[model samples]
Target: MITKYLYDENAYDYHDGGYRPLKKAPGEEHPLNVPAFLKPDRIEGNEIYYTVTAQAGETKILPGKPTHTWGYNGSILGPAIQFETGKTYHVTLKNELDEVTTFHWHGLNIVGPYEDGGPHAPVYPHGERKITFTVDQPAANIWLHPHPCPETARQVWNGLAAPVIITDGHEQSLKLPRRWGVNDFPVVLQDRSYHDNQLDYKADYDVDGTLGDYALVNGTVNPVVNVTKPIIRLRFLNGSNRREWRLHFADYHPFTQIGSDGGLLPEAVEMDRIMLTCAERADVLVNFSDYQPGQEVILQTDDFNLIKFKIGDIKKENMLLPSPLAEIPALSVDENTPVFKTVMSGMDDQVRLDGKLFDMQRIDTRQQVDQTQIWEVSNTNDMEGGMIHPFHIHGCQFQLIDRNGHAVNPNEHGWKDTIGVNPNETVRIRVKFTKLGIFMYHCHILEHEDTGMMAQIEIFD
Candidate 1:
């Protein structure tokens, strides 16, 4: 059967190229804000837990007026939710708002659409739901946000995102900086626009996705990250609902990418530039030995201004880079392995997976728990000029099989829960879900998923 495309030749603004421009100057943008890692309140026989709330509040983002936003614990936030692989976590999802919300874990392998926290699962107004799951995958930078269907984009834009750090015994052995807010940091990169000091998602909405002029790093307008160590690990999460972050340092200094959406790579893959789509995470170690103190290194792209790395005096430094970061082996599946090939396409309300809108009662694909299989995910968006769809899956991580019959980046040597499927390209990935349940596989472009470009897959025991 022929693939039915939905995007018009020029319906999307970013079709020919980038049309959205960076907000001229984040007036008074500087001192970098490092998000605090969440602290689990208690522990019981490996049950590390915390009660997280999603509440709406007001914050001053433009200096004068207070902007309304939603957050996990604060007005706009990111608390490090540290968890061990073998340990279980009981996260109490409290929806303090009048509306409902779902706590969707972006990149952790777990059971669901219930505990998985997709749009189907809801935390009622003034109500709470405790979802428990064990850390069954490798240590990686994951995020949690409200996934309440059509409102996912707006809610996220209004500050409904938080970061979670999964740690393991094996990951601890890796020679990497582990200190929080000092040598290690989580930069939840997002874009926003202000209309009279208030965010206007409607003002920036395009059929493809929303793009903001104002760049907010860790929910702050103008921020700078003070760095002191020779080697500090920088975790970049493209938390923007629609914008694609194409970033590179000013000096073009080579840095080691230790992890992606999943965990540590087999070894550090040194690179200079990275194009991360929405919800993608890039964990890199940037060295500061090349410059003297008091120099601010800017991570930027032509269209967007990212974070500023302000160098400071270092007490001690570890200049050596680790070789074997983790035990990540390239996976392969048998010829008989059923391929779950799905198509991601469309624009605006026309967005869909396999040319149809998602149905609550229908399961698009089915797989056995722990059974390895190859999935050929294709982006049928015409190459004439279409956006790169960041394909994402819930409940498990997968290895990049191929991209249009070509090898993927060396950085993909590790596991990934999300990947960019270029226009008219078929990207293959080998996946194996450890948990048994239904999960969502959709475009990380939140707007696309909210509109319709999402599907469900059932993993059974």
Candidate 2:
């Protein structure tokens, strides 16, 4: 039987295992350590060779005792994998660990289903390498995480994933944030349970694994960032396995959001708060010029401070928010030549899509080449209370057509690969399959995904 733990009831203290207090040395500013953001330029018509490995590490969570953990490179959280648009990347993944692991290109478009690397594709125990077949997708923010069936939640909880950014012809033209660790930031948001500093993967925490009391922003506990400028670009990723982050600030201040999981939206959406489900990303800019120096502003979710931002002396006042940030061609129903319907239904565990669990050999849905299809994702289960399910699709970008006949938010009209469909709501998405390959679609709530709530779709030309 699986046991589930709820979040903290109080906002300040770490209840049952919630976030801890900020601990830092005197006069020492805690810098935001960016794990990945190294982009190597590739020549035209040349193969870009990259190597990655899954390894183990010994790090101390507490003062005296050392804990054994698994990570991608040297420690927890691997290096960032950066790729340019319209470039062929030959990625060589070497398994240096003792056990077996497969690298799933979370949101990339490759050639075959096998190359897409789900639980179906497996690598050897050690000294074995898995290579990518081909890369042909537009610019987007993707990720690489280990998919080891039953062990996926545990492994990722121990930090086996990294940020993967893909830039192409379209993204290069936009005047967006490109600074790696400074002004531009890739904020990986996750909540974990730790005992004496080591990550705890709860075996009974839900049929899908959800552990910990601490919500960590980019691997650090109670971390703070010193903002010197008025506007800072934040690429936010909800990396948690189960919890839904209703993100907002301590004060009621609006932030400008420019992009989502798929890419840059057509316009900026300003809001005081936004809810991010697992595996979802939002690119936004926050202005801090109004605050006084040494003033502390906290980013909170449900009244809990996830991260603290302290104002600094180096600052400027910027008033204008970028309008019509990017141009995204609207997708019409006439453009959809085919319509595919997928049903996502199941319980806490033993969930299935089309009467099948996660089988590596099975292909759930298939589509014709270069076809624009209206993909309808329906959640059939009824919640006791009001429960929301965030649906996510891999490979191609799509536009939100409707939710139960009601038009979605205008902000979601642009390209999106993942969207939340409330209970009993049918989400219609207009998707153009430009790249032919196998990709997975499922609920964005990581717990539901691990339990079932997932299916695969293949696009063939």
Candidate 3:
């Protein structure tokens, strides 16, 4: 059981000058916008085909006018795309936007930089690109977003993101909530400031990272979710460019966290507070069996309410979760295991990954394919005036060994693709890339990434 946020509070983004605190939107509460499950164009046993179109459209967000937004196959945050383990998928990514964009699967273990949709893979206006890959990862709540170099921040801020859920037979055997809209939900947490109900990315851009004054839960402002089940699951994704969500309920209600960025934890963790950095995910279950109908719970980040859950119904049931959720294979390290080190330093526009900006043509590092090695990732900023850099790798999920030579938090036992590196701390992880190609690894703070705090690695065969 974890009772407090584990990260250093001095490095929170609100300590920065450019930080924007969230305010309740001026409109009435709207139903939580759960993106509809994406339907495949056709399905044949394990082969699935679908078309994801990136186009500009208007979404009715605020009261008066529709906000001009960009999404995959919709007006705003695209549909929830589902992938099953061991299934082959052929996707036609169409870009109807006026500019170029690349569809990057943030957490899936696929080949890069082209098939993985890094900066090297781009689709121009009115152009389309086809990509094929087989899902070989565990069940997890990942996401899809644009990854064009120098423009990733603005594109993501402009609403080019969607939820990706991967399922496997092992995960399906668990007694967790699986009903899509009725009980299970994807909560994409983001913040944005709109001018006259329209987005102005340039006006709010910050070299450190842009922060919006209003909370957007799955693309809807002032969202209220109806509670119907005694136990409900929330797959929370921190989709903001830079914001870190310190999530908790207003009443300090306890929740069970069953999964992380990669998949189910070895054992469920009970906590009242959990934090998620940019691009990180947490799958949690909340039990409302004690609360009576009409009692409400407000989910908040820090001190601001993000979603209001209005309890609507039903009788309480004595529900219990099975222990020993899943088996996690450890990546052991020996003296002969190769070790690599990278340093993340600076802030604002001066942020650099290994002291240099990202280069599309350069391969910053290389590792042998299928070799499990140790990577020591350090954030060199001091505690004072520093921020938590969410370090993310493109192709594979990793196991954290330690942080600053200390054991990782209890909830970090599962696989993770992104990690929040505390200031002046060194986080060691076991890295093994099954796919051979180039992949980008960088600070997930979109502005920092766009400003050159990124590097690439080549997994050589």
Error of 1 at 223 (Å): 1.3
Model 1 residue runs over 4 Å out of place are 1-18, 315-318, 329-332
Candidate 1 lDDT trough over 10 residues, lowest sum: 1-10
When summed lDDT is taken over every stretch of 10 residues in candidate 3, the lowest stretch is 314-323
**lDDT values for all models:** 0.79, 0.67, 0.91
> Which window of 10 residues has the lowest lDDT sum in candidate 2?
1-10
Order of the predicted models by lDDT, top scorer first: 3, 1, 2
Ranking by TM-score: 3, 1, 2
Better of 1 and 3 by TM-score: 3
Per lDDT, the best of the predicted structures is 3
TM-score of each: 0.93, 0.86, 0.99
Q: Give the lDDT of residue 226 in candidate 2.
A: 79
Error of 3 at 370 (Å): 0.9
How does model 2 fare in lDDT?
A: 0.67
Question: How would you encode candidate 2's per-residue C-alpha lDDT over 91-200 as one tens digit per residue?
Answer: 66777777777787776666545566666666766755546445565566677888766567777777787888877766676655466675677788776665665666
Cα lDDT tens digits for candidate 1, 1-461 = 11211122232335545467666544676566666667777878778889898988887777777888888888876466777888888888888888878898889888898998998898889987988877877889999888887788888988888888888888777657877778888888888888888877787676667878878888887677778676788889989887767677776777777888998888777777776777889898878877788677888854455777878885555466567767786655777887877888765677779988877778998898867888888777677766677889998889987777877767777889888777788888898788888898888888888787888888886
Give the lDDT of residue 154 in candidate 3: 97
The deviation in Å at residue 356 for candidate 2 is 3.7
TM-score of 1: 0.93
How many residue pairs clash in each candidate at the backbone level? 9, 7, 0
Cα RMSD, each candidate: 4.5, 5.6, 0.9
